[PDB]
C-alpha cells in the first residue's frame, strides 16, 4: 500500500481554531515521511517523549490524532504529560502515559494584523478541572460566589472566555505561536 497521506492541510491552513475549540481529525491507511518538518527557520525543538524523532520513520502505528491551536509566548513549555497551571488544567490536558509530542513554531508574520487581533480566545475560569483529551466549548456563565448570575455581567459574574492580544510590536514572550499536537498509539 502506497498513498499520499494528507499531512499538508493539518498545519498549512489559512486560519486556525481557538485554544478551547481545537479540531480533532483522524487519518488512517497512509504513510508519510517526517523530513518535511525542517523547512521553517523559527522551528522549535521537538522535545519528544517516549519515541525519538530520529526513529520516527521505520516505526509503524495504527492511527494519527492531530489537533492544532494558536497560543501566546512562554506557553509551549506548559504542554506536558505531568504539569499544572492555567492553560493546562482548563483548556488542554495531556495524559501522563501518553506517547507522542507537539510541534510548535513562531507565527508572528501570519496570525497578527496591524490592528488588535482577537480572533483567538482561551478559557481561564472554570469550576473544576477537566480530564485529559477533552474539549469543552460552552458559553455558560459561572458564579464566583453566592450570586446567581443568570447571564448578567457584573460583580462575581465573569465570562470564562477571554481574547488574546496579538500585535507585531509585542515581544518574543507575547508573540503568537502555532502549535499542532501529534499522538502515537500502538
Amino acid at each position, epitope marked *: 500500500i502506497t498513498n499520499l497521506c494528507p499531512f499538508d492541510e493539518v498545519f498549512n491552513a489559512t486560519r486556525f481554531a481557538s485554544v478551547y475549540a481545537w479540531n480533532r481529525k483522524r487519518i488512517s491507511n497512509c504513510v508519510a515521511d517526517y523530513s518535511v518538518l525542517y523547512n521553517l527557520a523559527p522551528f522549535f525543538t521537538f522535545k519528544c517523549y517516549g519515541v525519538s524523532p530520529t526513529k520516527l520513520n521505520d516505526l509503524c502505528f495504527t492511527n494519527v490524532y492531530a489537533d492544532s491551536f494558536v497560543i501566546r509566548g512562554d506557553e509551549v513549555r506548559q504542554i506536558a504529560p505531568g504539569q499544572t497551571g492555567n492553560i493546562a488544567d482548563y483548556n488542554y490536558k495531556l495524559p501522563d502515559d501518553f506517547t507522542g509530542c507537539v510541534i510548535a513554531w513562531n507565527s508572528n508574520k501570519l496570525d497578527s494584523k496591524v490592528s488588535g487581533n*482577537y480572533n483567538y480566545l482561551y478559557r481561564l475560569f472554570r469550576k473544576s478541572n477537566l480530564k485529559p483529551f477533552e474539549r469543552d466549548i460552552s458559553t455558560e456563565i459561572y458564579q464566583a460566589g453566592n450570586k446567581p448570575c*443568570n447571564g448578567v*455581567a457584573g460583580f462575581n459574574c465573569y465570562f470564562p472566555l477571554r481574547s488574546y492580544s496579538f500585535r507585531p510590536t509585542y515581544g518574543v514572550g507575547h508573540q503568537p505561536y502555532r502549535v499542532v499536537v501529534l499522538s502515537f498509539e500502538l
Partner: antibody
C-alpha cells in the same frame, strides 16, 4: 473598543444600500449585538438583531414588526466585519443608524421568536442614510 | 407590542438639587429572581449615546455616582433620556425627555 462604520449615501427607494460596520480593540466573534436606527425627528427605535456564531449553535435572527422579513442582515467572523443589506426603501425609512453592541456576552432562555438582553454598553458613530427621489 | 410613556415632558434643572424622571410601562418586568429589565440612556447633543444605568437598580461603568437607579415592578424613577423594555421583540424608547437648565 470603539465602533467605526461607513457606507451612508443618497439612496433611491428600492435597490440596495451598502452598509458595513467594523470592530477594533475588542473581540467581535463572541459578542451578540444588533442595530439601532434613530430618525432625525423622533427618538431611537429598534430595527433588527442577530445572534453570535460561537454563543449558540443555532443562529437567532430577529427583526422589528414593521420590517419583519424586509431586511436581510448578517455578520462575518473574518476581518471583524458586520454587514447590512437592503432590498427596498421608503421615503419614511430615513434615519441615523448606530452600530449597537451589547454587554450580555451570552445567550440563554432565547427561542426563535424572542431573546432578552440586559443593556447596550457602547454605541458606535452614526451614519447619514438619507432617501430622496 | 407595548408603548413606554414618560410623565415629565420638560422640567427645569439646577446643579443644587438632583432631578427626577420616570418611565411608565404597561407590563410586568419582574420575570424571575426580581430582575427588572429596564435601562436608562444619556445622549449628548451630536454624540453617540452610551449606557449609565442598566437592569433597573443596578449601575454600570462611567457613572458619576449621582444618577442612582431606583424602581421596582412597573414603576421606575431616576440632553435627552430614554428607557428600555427587554421582554418582547420591540424595544420601545423615550419620546421627549429633553432635560434643560433652569433659566
Amino acid at each position: 473598543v470603539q465602533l467605526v462604520e461607513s457606507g451612508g449615501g443618497l439612496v433611491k427607494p428600492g435597490g440596495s444600500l451598502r452598509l458595513s460596520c467594523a470592530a477594533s480593540g475588542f473581540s467581535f466573534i463572541t459578542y451578540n449585538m444588533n442595530w439601532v436606527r434613530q430618525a432625525p425627528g423622533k427618538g431611537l427605535e429598534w430595527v433588527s438583531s442577530i445572534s453570535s456564531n460561537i454563543l449558540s449553535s443555532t443562529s437567532y435572527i430577529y427583526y422589528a414588526d414593521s420590517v419583519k422579513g424586509r431586511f436581510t442582515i448578517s455578520r462575518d467572523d473574518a476581518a471583524n466585519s458586520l454587514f447590512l443589506q437592503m432590498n427596498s426603501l421608503r421615503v419614511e425609512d430615513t434615519a441615523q443608524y448606530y452600530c449597537a453592541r451589547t454587554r450580555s456576552r451570552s445567550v440563554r432562555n432565547c427561542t426563535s421568536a424572542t431573546c432578552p438582553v440586559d443593556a447596550f454598553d457602547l454605541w458606535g458613530q452614526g451614519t447619514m442614510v438619507i432617501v430622496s427621489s | 407590542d407595548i408603548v413606554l410613556t414618560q410623565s415629565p415632558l420638560s422640567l427645569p434643572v439646577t446643579p443644587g438639587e438632583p432631578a427626577s424622571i420616570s418611565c411608565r410601562s404597561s407590563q410586568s418586568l419582574l420575570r424571575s429572581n426580581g430582575y427588572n429589565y429596564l435601562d436608562w440612556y444619556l445622549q449628548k447633543p451630536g454624540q453617540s449615546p452610551h449606557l449609565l444605568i442598566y437592569l433597573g437598580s443596578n449601575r454600570a461603568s462611567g457613572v458619576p455616582d449621582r444618577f442612582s437607579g431606583s424602581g421596582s415592578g412597573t414603576d421606575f424613577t431616576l440632553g435627552v433620556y430614554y428607557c428600555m423594555q427587554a421582554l418582547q421583540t420591540p424595544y420601545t424608547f423615550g419620546q421627549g425627555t429633553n432635560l434643560e437648565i433652569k433659566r
